[PDB]
């Protein structure tokens, strides 16, 4: 499915992911797309913080969902 | 959620301001 | 329209703003309501930092929307 990640600068990144894909895979895709390391990247969706041991289906992330990306210093 | 992101950003900005205060210290003494 | 801004301490402030009003107008309203300076206030909406040049309609802020207010030193 297609998902959208919005940063603090207003730029939206579209990623191709699956419900069984973990947040580590999403972090790796964000690192491949923008260059931000996974250790400094935090994903927020549906009122909860994304865990590396959890999947998109566990967080009830559907198609065309919008997540928030935070870059750590 | 927006609230926890705001709290995290506030804590990070407070760390930045504490680093700025440390720099001001290094200027002074 | 009526909008709500939540601070980091859980305090909620209700304001009357228009869709064409900018984030600077919202900062001026928050300054009139509480006394926090516009340069000392940061607005976050849907996980993205709001731009002062951009308006509420540009950030897709609707009626009864919830924004996050961060106090800057």
Curated annotation (Swiss-Prot), chains A, C:
The record marks 54, 72 as: Interacts with activating enzyme. There is a cross-link at residues 6, 11, 27, 29, 33, 48, 63 (Glycyl lysine isopeptide (Lys-Gly) (interchain with G-Cter in ubiquitin)). Phosphorylated at Ser-65 by PINK1 during mitophagy. Phosphorylated ubiquitin specifically binds and activates parkin (PRKN), triggering mitophagy. Phosphorylation does not affect E1-mediated E2 charging of ubiquitin but affects discharging of E2 enzymes to form polyubiquitin chains. It also affects deubiquitination by deubiquitinase enzymes such as USP30. Residues 1-73 form the Ubiquitin-like domain. The modification Phosphoserine is found at residue 65. The record marks 68 as: Essential for function. Changing residue 68 to G: Loss of DTX3L-mediated polyubiquitination of histone H3 and H4. The modification (Microbial infection) ADP-ribosylthreonine is found at residue 66. Changing residue 65 to D: Phosphomimetic mutant that binds and activates PRKN. It is found in: Cytoplasm; Nucleus. Exists either covalently attached to another protein, or free (unanchored). When covalently bound, it is conjugated to target proteins via an isopeptide bond either as a monomer (monoubiquitin), a polymer linked via different Lys residues of the ubiquitin (polyubiquitin chains) or a linear polymer linked via the initiator Met of the ubiquitin (linear polyubiquitin chains). This is Ubiquitin. The lineage of its organism: Eukaryota, Metazoa, Chordata, Craniata, Vertebrata. The chain holds residues 1 to 73 of 156 of the full protein.
From Swiss-Prot, chain B:
Widely expressed. Autophosphorylated (in vitro). It is found in: Cytoplasm. Belongs to the protein kinase superfamily. RIO-type Ser/Thr kinase family. Involved in regulation of type I interferon (IFN)-dependent immune response which plays a critical role in the innate immune response against DNA and RNA viruses. May act as an adapter protein essential for the recruitment of TBK1 to IRF3. Phosphorylates IFIH1 on 'Ser-828' interfering with IFIH1 filament assembly on long dsRNA and resulting in attenuated IFIH1-signaling. Can inhibit CASP10 isoform 7-mediated activation of the NF-kappaB signaling pathway. May play a role in the biogenesis of the 40S ribosomal subunit. Involved in the processing of 21S pre-rRNA to the mature 18S rRNA. Interacts with CASP10. Interacts with IRF3; RIOK3 probably mediates the interaction of TBK1 with IRF3. Associated with 40S pre-ribosomal particles. This is Serine/threonine-protein kinase RIO3. It comes from Homo sapiens. The lineage of its organism: Eukaryota, Metazoa, Chordata, Craniata, Vertebrata.
């Amino acid at each position: 499915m297609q998902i959208f990640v919005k940063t603090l600068t207003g730029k939206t990144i579209t990623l191709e992911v699956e419900p069984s894909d973990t947040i580590e895979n999403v972090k790796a895709k964000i690192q491949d797309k923008e260059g931000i390391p996974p250790d400094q990247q935090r994903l927020i969706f549906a009122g909860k913080q994304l865990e590396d041991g959890r999947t998109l289906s566990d967080y009830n992330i559907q198609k065309e969902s919008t997540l928030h990306l935070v870059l750590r210093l | 959620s927006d609230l926890m992101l705001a709290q995290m950003l506030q804590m990070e900005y407070d760390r930045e301001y504490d680093a700025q205060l440390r720099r001001e210290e290094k200027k002074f003494n």
